[PDB]
Scaffold this active site. Structure first.
Site, PDB file in Angstrom:
ATOM      1  N   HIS A 150       0.553  -2.124  -0.368  1.00 43.37           N
ATOM      2  CA  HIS A 150       0.189   0.333  -0.130  1.00 43.37           C
ATOM      3  C   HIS A 150       0.456   1.456  -0.090  1.00 43.37           C
ATOM      4  CE1 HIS A 150      -3.259  -3.088   1.115  1.00 43.37           C
ATOM      5  NE2 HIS A 150      -3.552  -2.217   0.719  1.00 43.37           N
ATOM      6  N   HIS A 208       1.528   1.767  -5.625  1.00 46.30           N
ATOM      7  CA  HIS A 208      -0.196   0.814  -5.825  1.00 46.30           C
ATOM      8  C   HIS A 208      -0.889   1.755  -5.991  1.00 46.30           C
ATOM      9  CE1 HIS A 208      -3.759  -0.957  -4.679  1.00 46.30           C
ATOM     10  NE2 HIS A 208      -3.912   0.123  -4.080  1.00 46.30           N
ATOM     11  N   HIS A 238      -6.404   7.291  -2.247  1.00 40.99           N
ATOM     12  CA  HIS A 238      -7.378   6.480  -1.814  1.00 40.99           C
ATOM     13  C   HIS A 238      -7.044   5.893  -1.116  1.00 40.99           C
ATOM     14  CE1 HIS A 238      -5.496   3.285  -4.591  1.00 40.99           C
ATOM     15  NE2 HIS A 238      -5.992   2.321  -3.615  1.00 40.99           N
ATOM     16  N   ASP A 239      -5.220   5.768  -0.862  1.00 43.57           N
ATOM     17  CA  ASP A 239      -4.462   4.970   0.211  1.00 43.57           C
ATOM     18  C   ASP A 239      -3.113   5.818   0.513  1.00 43.57           C
ATOM     19  OD1 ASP A 239      -5.952   2.887   0.504  1.00 43.57           O
ATOM     20  OD2 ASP A 239      -4.848   0.627  -1.328  1.00 43.57           O
ATOM     21  N   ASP A 261      -8.635  -0.844  -8.329  1.00 42.49           N
ATOM     22  CA  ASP A 261      -8.201  -1.375  -7.134  1.00 42.49           C
ATOM     23  C   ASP A 261      -7.886  -2.596  -6.611  1.00 42.49           C
ATOM     24  OD1 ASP A 261      -7.375  -0.747  -4.510  1.00 42.49           O
ATOM     25  OD2 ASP A 261      -8.479  -0.674  -3.507  1.00 42.49           O
ATOM     26  N   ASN A 275      -4.675  -6.025  -9.207  1.00 41.13           N
ATOM     27  CA  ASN A 275      -3.633  -6.471  -9.635  1.00 41.13           C
ATOM     28  C   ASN A 275      -3.315  -7.761 -11.186  1.00 41.13           C
ATOM     29  OD1 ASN A 275      -2.558  -5.966  -6.113  1.00 41.13           O
ATOM     30  ND2 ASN A 275      -2.760  -4.983  -8.324  1.00 41.13           N
ATOM     31  N   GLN A 292      -4.645 -17.102  -3.808  1.00 45.66           N
ATOM     32  CA  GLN A 292      -4.753 -15.817  -4.577  1.00 45.66           C
ATOM     33  C   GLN A 292      -5.713 -16.565  -5.650  1.00 45.66           C
ATOM     34  OE1 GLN A 292      -3.698 -12.876  -5.956  1.00 45.66           O
ATOM     35  NE2 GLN A 292      -3.204 -13.374  -3.765  1.00 45.66           N
ATOM     36  N   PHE A 340      -9.062 -15.908  -4.062  1.00 46.28           N
ATOM     37  CA  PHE A 340      -9.250 -14.670  -4.359  1.00 46.28           C
ATOM     38  C   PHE A 340      -9.741 -14.058  -5.301  1.00 46.28           C
ATOM     39  CE2 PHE A 340      -6.997  -9.956  -4.931  1.00 46.28           C
ATOM     40  CZ  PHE A 340      -8.422  -9.400  -3.886  1.00 46.28           C
TER      41      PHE A 340
HETATM   42  C1  LIG Z   1     -14.153  -8.872   3.159  1.00 46.41           C
HETATM   43  O1  LIG Z   1     -13.338  -8.018   2.554  1.00 46.41           O
HETATM   44  C2  LIG Z   1     -12.386  -8.789   2.132  1.00 46.41           C
HETATM   45  C3  LIG Z   1     -12.160  -9.872   1.386  1.00 46.41           C
HETATM   46  C4  LIG Z   1     -11.359 -10.170   0.601  1.00 46.41           C
HETATM   47  C5  LIG Z   1     -10.214  -9.964   1.431  1.00 46.41           C
HETATM   48  C6  LIG Z   1      -8.315 -10.974   0.231  1.00 46.41           C
HETATM   49  C7  LIG Z   1      -9.203 -12.088   0.194  1.00 46.41           C
HETATM   50  C8  LIG Z   1      -7.808 -13.092  -0.252  1.00 46.41           C
HETATM   51  C9  LIG Z   1      -7.832 -15.127  -0.424  1.00 46.41           C
HETATM   52  C10 LIG Z   1      -6.724 -12.424  -0.867  1.00 46.41           C
HETATM   53  C11 LIG Z   1      -6.658 -10.648  -1.374  1.00 46.41           C
HETATM   54  C12 LIG Z   1      -7.749 -10.312  -0.386  1.00 46.41           C
HETATM   55  O2  LIG Z   1      -7.588  -8.679  -0.497  1.00 46.41           O
HETATM   56  C13 LIG Z   1      -6.098  -7.995  -0.455  1.00 46.41           C
HETATM   57  C14 LIG Z   1      -6.289  -6.771  -0.580  1.00 46.41           C
HETATM   58  C15 LIG Z   1      -6.151  -5.446   0.143  1.00 46.41           C
HETATM   59  C16 LIG Z   1      -6.026  -4.312  -0.124  1.00 46.41           C
HETATM   60  O3  LIG Z   1      -7.477  -4.237  -0.198  1.00 46.41           O
HETATM   61  C17 LIG Z   1      -7.613  -4.427  -1.731  1.00 46.41           C
HETATM   62  C18 LIG Z   1      -7.775  -6.170  -1.058  1.00 46.41           C
HETATM   63  C19 LIG Z   1      -5.741  -8.509  -0.913  1.00 46.41           C
HETATM   64  C20 LIG Z   1      -5.474 -10.233  -1.930  1.00 46.41           C
HETATM   65  O4  LIG Z   1      -4.720 -11.023  -2.236  1.00 46.41           O
HETATM   66  C21 LIG Z   1      -9.628  -8.972   1.982  1.00 46.41           C
HETATM   67  C22 LIG Z   1     -10.224  -8.580   2.344  1.00 46.41           C
HETATM   68  O5  LIG Z   1      -9.949  -7.398   3.728  1.00 46.41           O
HETATM   69  C23 LIG Z   1      -8.981  -6.966   3.092  1.00 46.41           C
HETATM   70 ZN   LIG Z   2      -5.336   0.430  -2.315  1.00 47.15          ZN
HETATM   71 ZN   LIG Z   3      -7.278   0.780   1.195  1.00 46.29          ZN
END
Ligand SMILES: COc1ccc(-c2cc(C)cc3c2O[C@H](C2CCOCC2)C=C3O)cc1OC
Ligand SMILES: [Zn+2]
Ligand SMILES: [Zn+2]
Length: 328
Positions: A78, A82, A118-119, A236, A239, A287, A290
């Site tokens: 962050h 980014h 935003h970050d 956002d 990636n 991943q 995700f």
């Molecule tokens: C419920 O909120 C969320 C839902 C999924 C994620 C999540 C879940 C997985 C498996 C991987 C990821 C993920 O979010 C992060 C990022 C962190 C900063 O904000 C955008 C997503 C990057 C991943 O590679 C994170 C959350 O909170 C940041």
């Molecule tokens: Zn961001």
């Molecule tokens: Zn953010």
């Protein structure tokens, strides 16, 4: 009055600024760790935002450097890079054929400015971490969208530093509208808002209307802002839609940021956050989940909104998903 060679090499990379898969890390290097400043400057010039909003160039540069200085260099994901990436990705999404002539210059300015800030001042730990530690930031924002509220407040506050007010020539009307749109967009970057945003995006896809020739029709603030919110949210979470060489660099950084939070959590007997345990992790599996559960449903829905402009982006996403899955 002629560029140094490093400046010229930077300039040639910047010719990809209108394309998905910009060499953003190379730009970060070539610019002396000024990817956000140079990419914002290039974008503002490309979209003629300086003339349209009467932004003095030195004021724009001073604010951008100041904004960029408030991203943390010791934060693996962050950070300013980014920020720069989200800005440029939002920039590309704004130019999708399906959205041609839809948004006003002020709305365009809002989406780009929101992306940039935003970050800002991200400490590299999550809202839950900040809440659980009884942090001053969490108490300031009553545990609610803590970081996202902080990013906004910082991004706006920095306009008050010496020669930083890039909105100094906008009318009160323009400023109030710009400000509301920026706030709505950045607060929508809170992942806790993801399911709701996506539901609304779907609802719009089902009831969407096109137009004279072809291009979306958005005839109320609710709809226009919802699309901008999702657009920046898409940026956002872009990636995994980027060429694997880029995506992997992002994954390394976010994983480094996550494990570091896990380390700080373990250091103090806190329960370790999901994906933050460097001893019990599965990067590949995370991943895939995700993508399957968040990124793919979002981008699929976005691709439907702008059909078929996002087909190549979606295909890259699925290829990367297959690649990761292929690796246990
Ligand atoms: C419920 O909120 C969320 C839902 C999924 C994620 C999540 C879940 C997985 C498996 C991987 C990821 C993920 O979010 C992060 C990022 C962190 C900063 O904000 C955008 C997503 C990057 C991943 O590679 C994170 C959350 O909170 C940041
Ligand atoms: Zn961001
Ligand atoms: Zn953010």
């Amino acid at each position: 009055g002629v560029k140094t060679e490093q400046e010229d090499v930077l300039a040639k990379e910047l010719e990809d600024v209108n394309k998905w898969g910009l060499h953003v890390f190379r730009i970060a290097e070539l610019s002396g760790n000024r990817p956000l400043t140079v990419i914002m400057h290039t974008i503002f010039q490309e979209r003629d935002l300086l003339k349209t909003f009467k932004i003095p160039v030195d004021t724009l540069i001073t604010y951008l450097m100041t904004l960029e200085d408030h991203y943390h260099a010791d934060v693996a994901y962050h950070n300013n890079i980014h920020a720069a990436d989200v800005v440029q990705s939002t920039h590309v999404l704004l130019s999708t054929p399906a959205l041609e002539a839809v948004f006003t210059d002020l709305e365009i300015l809002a989406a780009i400015f929101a992306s940039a800030i935003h970050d800002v001042d991200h400490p590299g730990v999550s809202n839950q971490f900040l809440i659980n530690t009884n942090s001053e930031l969490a108490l300031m924002y009553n545990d609610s969208s803590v970081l996202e509220n902080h990013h906004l407040a910082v991004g706006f506050k920095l306009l008050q530093e010496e020669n930083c007010d890039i909105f100094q020539n906008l009318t009160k009307k323009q400023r109030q509208s710009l400000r509301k749109m920026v706030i709505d967009i950045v607060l929508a970057t809170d992942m806790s808002k993801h399911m709701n945003l996506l539901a609304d995006l779907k609802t719009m896809v089902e009831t969407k209307k096109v137009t004279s020739s072809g291009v979306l029709l958005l005839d109320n603030y609710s709809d226009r802002i919802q699309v901008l919110q999702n657009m920046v949210h898409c940026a956002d979470l872009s990636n995994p839609t980027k060429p694997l060489q880029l995506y992997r660099q992002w994954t390394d950084r976010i994983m480094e940021e996550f494990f570091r939070q896990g380390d700080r959590e373990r250091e103090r007997g806190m329960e370790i956050s999901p994906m933050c345990d460097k001893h019990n992790a599965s990067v590949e599996k995370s991943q895939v989940g995700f993508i399957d559960y968040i990124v793919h449903p979002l981008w699929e829905t976005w691709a439907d909104l702008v059909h078929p402009d996002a087909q190549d982006i979606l295909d890259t996403l699925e290829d990367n998903r297959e690649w990761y899955q292929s690796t246990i």
